Amino acid sequence: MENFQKVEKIGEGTYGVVYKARNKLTGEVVALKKIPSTAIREISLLKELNHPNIVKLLDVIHTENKLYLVFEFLHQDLKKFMDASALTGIPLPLIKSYLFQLLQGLAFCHSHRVLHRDLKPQNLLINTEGAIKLADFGLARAFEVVTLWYRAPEILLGCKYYSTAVDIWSLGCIFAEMVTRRALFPGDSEIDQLFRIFRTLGTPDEVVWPGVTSMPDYKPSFPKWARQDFSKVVPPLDEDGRSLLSQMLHYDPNKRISAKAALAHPFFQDVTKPVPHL
Ligand SMILES: CN(C)CCNS(=O)(=O)c1ccc(N/C=C2\C(=O)Nc3ccccc32)cc1
Numbered sequence: 001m002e003n004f005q006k007v008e009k010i011g012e013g014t015y016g017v018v019y020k021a022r023n024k025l026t027g028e029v030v031a032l033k034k035i036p037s038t039a040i041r042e043i044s045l046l047k048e049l050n051h052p053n054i055v056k057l058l059d060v061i062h063t064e065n066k067l068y069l070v071f072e073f074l075h076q077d078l079k080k081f082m083d084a085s086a087l088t089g090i091p092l093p094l095i096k097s098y099l100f101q102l103l104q105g106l107a108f109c110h111s112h113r114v115l116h117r118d119l120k121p122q123n124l125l126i127n128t129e130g131a132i133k134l135a136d137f138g139l140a141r142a143f144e145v146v147t148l149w150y151r152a153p154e155i156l157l158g159c160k161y162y163s164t165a166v167d168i169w170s171l172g173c174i175f176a177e178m179v180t181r182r183a184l185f186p187g188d189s190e191i192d193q194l195f196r197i198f199r200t201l202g203t204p205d206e207v208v209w210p211g212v213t214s215m216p217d218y219k220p221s222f223p224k225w226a227r228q229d230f231s232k233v234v235p236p237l238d239e240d241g242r243s244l245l246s247q248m249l250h251y252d253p254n255k256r257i258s259a260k261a262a263l264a265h266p267f268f269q270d271v272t273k274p275v276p277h278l
Contacts, residue, residue, distance in 0.1 A: 001061065001068060004032055014118065014136070015143050020073060030058060031074075035067040035143065042142040043069070049114055053105030055125055055135040074125035074133065076278060078174070081126055086181055094274045095178045096267065098124075098132045102171055105134045107259035110164040114138050119170035120150050121177070130273045148193040149173065149186050153204070154253055156194045158216030165253035168262070172248030179237050195223070201249060202227030209251040240267040 004021045011018035013033055021032040040062055047057050056072035078098075082090065090098075102124065109116065116123075117140035125133050152169035154162050176184040185200070187193025198204070203224045204212045212218060230242040237245070244267045247257035257265075 001063065004030070004070075006032070011122070012144055014146060015139060023070075028058075029073050031055075031071040033069040033071065035069065039067070039142050042138070043067075046114070046138045046142070049109060049112060049138065051105055051108045052131070053101050053133050054109065054137050055133045069139075071135070074127055074135075076126050077122055077135075078124040078126060078132065078178075079121035081276065081278070082121060082178065082181070089181055090178050091274065092179075093272055094130075094276055095175070096271050097130060097273050098126075098178070099171070099175050100263070100268050100271045101132050102134065102174075103259045103262050105137075106164075106167050106171065107263060109134075109137060110167070110259055115141065115164055116167045116170075117141070118146075118150075119167055119174065120147055121174060124174070126276060126278075128275070128278055130275050148188075148190060149183050151193060152253070153194065153197055153251060154215070156190055156197075157212070157218055163253050164258070165256040168248050168256050168259060172245055175241075175245060175248070176234050179234050179241070184233070198222065199225045200228050200233060201251065204251045212251070240265070240269075243267070 003024050005024065007020040007022060007029075009017060010020050010031060016034045019032045019034075021030050022028070023030055040060070043057075043060050047060065050056065055074065057069060058072060059070040061068040061070065106116070114137065116134060116137050118136065119134070123135040125135050127133075148156075150170035150173045152162065152166040155166060173184045185193060185196040187196050202208070203222055206213055213220070230237075230246055234242060234245060244257070244262060244265045247265075248262065250256040
């Protein structure tokens with residue numbers, strides 16, 4: 001670590017504090033995250049998982065029982081950009097570009113059997129060129145209140161062997177939030193999160209989600225709410241966008257659209273790559 005000069009604190013991350021730093025050997029500006037052998041090996045595998053829509057893991061430094069992760073640096077996260085665009089809204093072509101790029105990143109990771117598990121606006125980073133990238137990819141398998149807003153229902157219901165579908169759910173929640181300028185399911189406890197999902201999408205049952213009633217944290221005493229139309233949930237999203245969103249928010253993880261199939265969706269027939277106003 002004597003090769004890095006800290007510039008400023010850029011986040012109180014999930015596993016530790018993230019700093020903007022300068023590498024003295026290469027002159028490179030980086031993001032430095034200060035965090036067992038199982039972890040060293042899994043983290044070392046993430047150094048090979050390179051894609052244009054994944055924030056690059058440059059190096060892993062294990063010294064004096066501390067672990068430092070050196071990442072590519074980007075200047076803004078999607079949370080800040082959404083807050084800055086609250087009065088006007090992010091233009092639909094840019095929302096579409098960002099969703100398309102994030103699905104490309106997820107298709108890549110998922111093809112290598114790597115899950116993110118904690119997608120949220122704070123770990124989606126943007127640049128001046130119109131790119132958006134997934135940050136902290138794979139750190140949840142390897143290792144302030146953690147937000148539950150983007151957590152898939154199977155996780156909330158106690159599935160310990162969940163799938164790549166959890167990342168599609170989180171991304172669907174983020175898509176809805178870009179469109180409406182408000183979080184879709186802002187729960188402040190696990191039960192509040194689950195019941196907010198149920199109030200919008202309907203309480204799940206064996207018809208829509210075979211096996212749901214046997215899940216660990218499923219309770220037959222859950223209230224039975226009717227499902228709402230998506231036209232009420234994400235106005236003024238068009239029918240292609242609503243169709244895609246509905247497929248990203250299917251209850252059954254097996255029915256939920258994959259990232260690769262989502263890329264082929266008609267919503268992306270007119271996708272472009274606009275420059276954001278930063
Ligand atoms: C100092 N303060 C107010 C900044 C917080 N808000 S921000 O400007 O939107 C902002 C600026 C930069 C960042 N970077 C975050 C990361 C980065 O670059 N690589 C990473 C790899 C893994 C995890 C995080 C990052 C985020 C937000």
